[PDB]
Each structure stands twice: as C-alpha cells, then as structure tokens.
Amino acid sequence: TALQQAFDTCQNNKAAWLQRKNELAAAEQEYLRLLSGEGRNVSRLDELRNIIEVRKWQVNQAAGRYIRSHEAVQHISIRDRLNDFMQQHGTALAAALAPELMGYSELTAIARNCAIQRATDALREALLSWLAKGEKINYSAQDSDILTTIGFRPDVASVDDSREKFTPAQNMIFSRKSAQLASRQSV
Amino acid sequence: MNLTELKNTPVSELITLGENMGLENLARMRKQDIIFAILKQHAKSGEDIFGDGVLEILQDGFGFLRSADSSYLAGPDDIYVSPSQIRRFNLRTGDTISGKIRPPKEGERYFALLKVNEVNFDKPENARNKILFENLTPLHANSRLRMERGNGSTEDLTARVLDLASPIGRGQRGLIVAPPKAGKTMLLQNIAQSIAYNHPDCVLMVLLIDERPEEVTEMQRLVKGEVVASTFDEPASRHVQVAEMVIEKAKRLVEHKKDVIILLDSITRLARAYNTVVPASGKVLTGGVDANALHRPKRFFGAARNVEEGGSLTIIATALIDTGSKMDEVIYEEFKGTGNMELHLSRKIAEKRVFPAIDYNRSGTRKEELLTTQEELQKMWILRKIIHPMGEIDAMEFLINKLAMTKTNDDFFEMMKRS
Ligand SMILES: Nc1ncnc2c1ncn2[C@@H]1O[C@H](COP(=O)(O)OP(=O)(O)OP(O)(O)=S)[C@@H](O)[C@H]1O
Ligand SMILES: [Mg+2]
Secondary structure, three states, X not given: OHHHHHHHXXXXXXXXXXXXXXXXXXXXXXXXXXXXXXXXXXXXXXXXXXXXXXXXXHHHHHHHHHHHHHHHHHHHHHHHHXXXXXHHHHHHHHHHHHHHOOOOOOOXXXXXXXXXXXXXXXXXXXXXXXXXXXXXXXXXXXXXXXXXXXXXXXXXXXXXXXXXXXXXXXXXXXXXHHXXXXXXXXX | OOHHHHHHOOHHHHHHHHHHHOOOOOOOOOHHHHHHHHHHHHHOOOOOOOOEEEEEEOOOOOEEEEOOOOOOOOOOOOEEEOHHHHHHOOOOOOOEEEOOEEOOOOOOOOEEEOOOOEEOOOOOOOOOOOOOXXXXXXXXXXXXXXXXXXXXXXXXXXXXXXXXXXXXXOOOEEEEEOOOOOOHHHHHHHHHHHHHHHOOOOEEEEEEEOOOHHHHHHHOOOOOOEEEEEOOOOOHHXXXXXXXXXXXXXXXXXXXXXXXXXXXXXXXXXXXXXXXHOOOOOOEEOOOEEHHHOHHXXXXXXXXXXXXXXXXXXXXXXXXXXXXXXXXXXXXXXXXXXXXXXXXXXXXHHHOOOOOOEEEEEEEEOOHHHHOOHHHHHHHHHHHHHHOOOOHHHHHHHHHHHHHOOOOHHHHHHHHHOO
C-alpha cells in the first residue's frame, strides 16, 4: 500500500519543485528588469539579491527532496517486484543456487557471508550475460503506469540544480533567512 | 479579565479589546498602564477573577506583587500584599501566589489581593509547615544532565562537544569563562533548549542583564521556558533588584524539592552593578572595587547546591575575559575556585571559526567519579590522553571531523576504541 503514497509524495514534491523554479524565474526576471531600469534604488537591488539567494536555496532543497523521493519510489518498486518474482520462482532460483546454499541455517556467519558473495557475483555474471544478450526491457504490468509517469530517471533540471553542496551551518542560516523573509513578505 | 491572557497577547489585541467596550484612546499609554486601565474598567462591571504573581517585601512591612512577563518591573500592574497576609499565611519573598484579586478601590492606585488559593503551585494550607533554607545541607552533583539529542545538527554537534568535554550534573556550580565573540549566545542557547528538550520536568529559567535589546527579544521567542531580563537601558538598581528577586524566587522554588537550572549572564556585570549600587566601605582594592561589593555576588553564586531530601539547584554562569577593563580580572580572580567546574574558551580558535571554541585542556570538573560511572569516566580519560599531546585547535578539528559522521557519542565510543 506504500506504492500509492510514495507515488503521490513524489508527484507533489515535483509540483512544489516546479513552483520553486517558476518563483525563482519570476524573481530573476524582476531583478533583471530593475537592473535595466533607470531606477537606482540600491535597497531594492539588495533585497532582490536576497530574494534570489533564498529562492535558489529553496529550489536546491526542493530538487534534493524530489530526488530522494524518486529514489525511494524506485527502491520500493524494485523491492516489491523482487518480492513477488521470488515468491513465484524461488524453487527455480534455489535449484540453480543449491551447490553453495545448502545448510544456510547451520552455517556460521563468515560461511554465510562467503556463500552470499558467491551467489552475488554468480548472479552478477548472469545479469551481465543477460545484458549482453541485448533484449529491450519492459516495465511490469502490475506497476506500469506509475513507473512510466515517474520515469526511469528524474529530470535533468533536478540533478543539475543539486550540484552545489551546502554545509549544515549554511543550510540552517538559509532556513532562518527564508523563514523571516516569508514572514515579512506575507505581511 | 485575567492578566495572563491580557499580557501574553500583543498590544494590538489589548487595544482592540479596550475599544470593544469603550476606553479612552489606548495608543498613548504603556503596556503596564494599558493593562492596569483595561482591567480596572473591565472589573468595574462586577465580576472577580484569579490573579497570579510573585511577591516581594520592601523596607516597609507592606509588600508588592510583580509579574514574570513584565521583566520584574514595578508599575501599575503591581498587586498589594498587606502584612496581615504575611502573618496569616507565613508569606515571604519569591513565592508564586495565585488567588482572588481586588479591583483598586478609591484612595489606592495599584491592584489589590483578596484571597490566596495557590501558593507555590500548591495549596496554601499544606504549605504552612515548610523546611526553610538555613538548615539545608548540600550534596555533590550526582544526577547527570543530558544535553544531547543525536539528530546530528551543528547545534547537536556543539551539545555533544560540551557533553564530552566536561560532565554537567544536577545541583552543581559551574563557570563559563569566555571573551567576547566566543559564541556565548548560541552556546547558552544550546544548553537552554537541550535541557528543555531533555528534562521538561524541571523548570527552566534564564536571567539576563545589560544585554542588547535584540538579543533578549530573540531570546523571548527561542526558549520554551520563561526568561527574565533587564537590558543596560535600566539603571544598575533595576539589575540588582531583578537578580536578587529571581535568585530568591529560585531558592523558594527549589525549597519545594523542585529541580532548577540557572543560566547566568554575567557574574562580572552583576559585580559591577552591585559595586555601583552598594555604598562604599572605605576599603577599595584595585579596579575601584571595595570589599563589600563582591560579597553579595559571592553568596549569589554560592547558592548552587544539591539538596539531600529532594531537588537540586544547578547554576552555570559566564564571565567576561580580557575585555581591557581592569576590574574584569579582579572579579575573575575573586570568583576562581568557588565553582564545581569551569569551561574555557579562546579567541585564536574562533579566528578560524572552529565552532564551538571550547578549550578541552583547560576544561575540568571536580569529583567526576560520583557524578558518572567508572566505565564512561575511563572512556573520557582516554580522550583526555589523546587530546593532551597535540594542540587545542587541532584537537578541535580532529574531534569535530571524527564526531560529525557519528550519530551519537555512544556509538562514537566503539567507533574510536577500535582505532
Ligand atoms: N555552533 C554555531 N553554529 C553556527 N554559527 C555559529 C556557531 N557558533 C558560533 N557561530 C557564529 O559565531 C558568530 C559570533 O557569535 P556570537 O554569539 O555573536 O559571539 P558571542 O560569544 O555571543 O559574543 P558577542 O555576542 O558577539 S558580544 C556568529 O556569526 C555565529 O553565526
Ligand atoms: Mg553573545
């Protein structure tokens, strides 16, 4: 049931990120227009520069949270597809993996880990061979529409806007500045 | 027409409510004047209410009652306390009294009190018999105080740093020596909100004197506990009377086996204020300070202790360092050795902006064994031995770097022991 809530969380995060980008664009165009204008009010220029900084920080935060929500949605979908696929073909997997999976319960921790890594690189080679075969991969029927709407990868505008990294002190001072700025602008 | 909701709400609500039933134009009086008036006309209709405050006794036997939000400032909001009340309910200074009040009658200009119904958040009848301060016996700080959240923010990192640098326990006596621009503000914040988020059971108070108005007004909206302050605009008499009133109220509160924690700013400013207000004793030492001036702050700071039967008064205070005024080091040297522990801060650390600028090597505590366990204390001396060889600032970057990625100090212990 977490699939639907994750999907709507991702879509509303994307909508809020779009809101942030168009607000930032409006602020940028207003600042450019006032710069091109004859008006020399330095206070307006400084407050618009503060607007630009706050808006770009908010856009970066929105992009980051949208990316993390998208990754969470993809992880949940992958987990569910793996779960029902293994519930379908567990005997089929285990028939092939038997030579190094016998007595897993009685095996010690290091033996369990070594068997896990052996199965790990075995299936890694199997997936490499499958990719080398080169057939195009299609989404599951049960989760087709949600994955198509979300897409394989997020928008490039989300990933290129998160290039800059902010230290926690900068993030917190930006949070206070944005809070006070919104409080003053609302009035 | 209880003064609590008429005082917590902004002046706009007060003037709106005044215009609702028709007072004279309210945009010219003061907050105390406005509340006094509006309560007088609204109480003239014929109903009575409760009333809460803290009582003090002046030179005369008659007493006054003040409010906490008004920064302990005398005014029309003060409530009469007749000496008959002092006899019939053994009243003394610093008790929180809630009860029926009386509208100001003719010939009297402040508010009056009719009956008492809650003395020190308790029934007055059962509070008649009480153990007073002079016979109380102190004790070592045993109950460890937690200031760590584990969330991992910069405030959380500073909290973890101050926790590991020196232990803080209930009913202790501590000092925070730091020159200006050493981060005293967000440090004192850190302590305030950390013990507020960790120990809601104990009441939180912060007293502030001669700070800037912006600092105190951003204090009022940052800490959940009540904060009392008086800036440098008021004379030194206001500062000293606020300090004495609040410390005696805290003593009365802790007399009820209630844990109380005090953030004090600053012992040097307090000593200067008392020196200005106290009469000269004829024996002035270096710095224009006479002997009796520092005697009041001595017992002011010495009131911190841990009570045997219940409750604990913890006081952590800050002192100005090397500000260029010759009395600052006088009060410094006078107050050294009187506290259970001290925390040092430096300037060269904050020049490179390594926050917090605490000095681990100079930091220390007395009787750490009783306050904590041997295992965690040894897990502390190991950090001590690690930090002694290299420099203080280098240890600062080392500690912040190797504590940043770790969520909590407890996990940090096993993360560092393997190295
Ligand atoms: N933990 C911290 N997180 C973020 N900024 C900090 C931290 N500690 C110190 N600072 C910065 O340190 C600078 C100075 O701090 P202050 O609190 O103003 O110094 P101070 O010790 O209180 O002395 P004053 O107030 O200047 S007289 C500010 O710009 C703060 O942002
Ligand atoms: Mg400060």
